[PDB]
C-alpha cells in the first residue's frame, strides 16, 4: 500500500545503518543501535532511546534489522493522515472563508453544537494561543493548539 513518503531519509538512514559494525553486518545491537542512531543526525535526550532499545526485544536477541530501525525512528514522529480531514473542519469553523479563525467564527461552532460553553472560554482560548498580538489565530497556531491528549 503506497501513500507517498519522503525518500531523502530512507537513503541516508540506510547508509549509516549499513556502513558500520565490523565482525559482520545486516543488523545492529543495543549499543550499536545508539551509535548508528547518533550519527544519523538529531541527538535529543537518551531516555526515548533507552526505553525503545529494551522494547524492541522480543522472542530473539537484541540485534535489530534495518526495516525495524526505520519504522521506529519514523514512528517517533507519529504518522497519521489528518490533512483534508482538518481542512473540512476549517470551513465549518470559519465563516468568511480565509486562513485565520476569528472569535465570532469559533463561537459559532460552539453555540451550534450547544454544550453551553459561554463566550468566556472563547476569549480565554485566544489569550492562551495567538502567535502575534492579534485577536485572531492562523491555521497554524490553530492546528498547533488543537489535537489535545
Amino acid at each position: 500500500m503506497a501513500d507517498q513518503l519522503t525518500e531523502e531519509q530512507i537513503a541516508e538512514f540506510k547508509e549509516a545503518f549499513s556502513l558500520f559494525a565490523k565482525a559482520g553486518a545486516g543488523t545492529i545491537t543495543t549499543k550499536q543501535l545508539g551509535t548508528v542512531m547518533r550519527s544519523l543526525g538529531q541527538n535529543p535526550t537518551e531516555a526515548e532511546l533507552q526505553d525503545m532499545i529494551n522494547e524492541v526485544a522480543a522472542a530473539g536477541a537484541g540485534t535489530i534489522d534495518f526495516p525495524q530501525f526505520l519504522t521506529m525512528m519514523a514512528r517517533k514522529m507519529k504518522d497519521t493522515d489528518s490533512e483534508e480531514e482538518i481542512r473540512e473542519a476549517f470551513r465549518v469553523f470559519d465563516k468568511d472563508g480565509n486562513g485565520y479563525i476569528s472569535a465570532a467564527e469559533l463561537r459559532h461552532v460552539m453555540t451550534n453544537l450547544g454544550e453551553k460553553l459561554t463566550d468566556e472560554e472563547v476569549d480565554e482560548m485566544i489569550r492562551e494561543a495567538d502567535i502575534d498580538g492579534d485577536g485572531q489565530v492562523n491555521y497554524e497556531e490553530f492546528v498547533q493548539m488543537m489535537t489535545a491528549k
Binding site: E85, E88, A89, V92, T147
Partner: peptide, 21 residues
C-alpha cells in the same frame, strides 16, 4: 459513513477536555 462525522469526533474531544479551567 466517511463524512463530517469524523470532524465532530475531533472538535468533540478537544471541547469536553479544555472545558475545565
Amino acid at each position: 459513513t466517511v463524512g463530517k462525522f469524523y470532524a465532530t469526533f475531533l472538535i468533540q474531544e478537544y471541547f469536553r477536555k479544555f472545558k475545565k479551567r
